[PDB]
Amino acid sequence: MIYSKVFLKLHWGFSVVKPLAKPGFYLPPPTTLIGALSYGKFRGVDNINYGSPAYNFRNIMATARLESEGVYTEDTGKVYIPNGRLVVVYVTDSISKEELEKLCWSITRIGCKECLASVENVEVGEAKKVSGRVKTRYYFRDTVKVVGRKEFLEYVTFWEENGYIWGKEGSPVRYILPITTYPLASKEVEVEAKEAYEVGGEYVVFS
């Protein structure tokens, strides 16, 4: 199981609108993170035999977190965090280290066209699996238990990869975000969980 870390510098922020008034999300879903990675190999093509040129990277695990302060504003929901930093962790085993590292440098935007994001540095390595009590900052699933004080937790709804095809709605999956609503920031939460990969001290929780 290989892991990779990437540091992104945002220009003005990201904007993803909720499916089904056009409110937006607080943090990008894993689908956008996988699509950004897939952009490095499928550049120039928009329809493959027809739902998306991204129904092939569906089994790559990804998480992301903030490192600065921002504000969520509806004026079409947007998340303004200019000059901020984003840390993205990719965990997978489908491809070797070289291919993941090459695709990691080829990220251009997160969400829509205006949400450009440069790349500052990357790291590649081998991860280890643990199950003891850990502290994490990345968001995880709803079914994961919590031992600490419930004070900085929010509930969101994301979709599986089934939504990659047009004319079809993805399955609804609940997610828990360790985020402060105003101002926008990230906080640490202690979880027990069953599977956690150590990617450099900042344990990533998946189930």
Place this chain on the structure above:
RNA sequence: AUUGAAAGUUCUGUUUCGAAGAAAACCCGCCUCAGAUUCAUUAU
């Protein structure tokens, strides 16, 4: 190539017209630079 893809809330407008900081008023009334000093002794 990501609930992503496709879009300007943009077009037309004077804070403008007028009204003296003006009139009267002394820096003027007394004071001294004052007393002492050889250019002469020698040259057809």
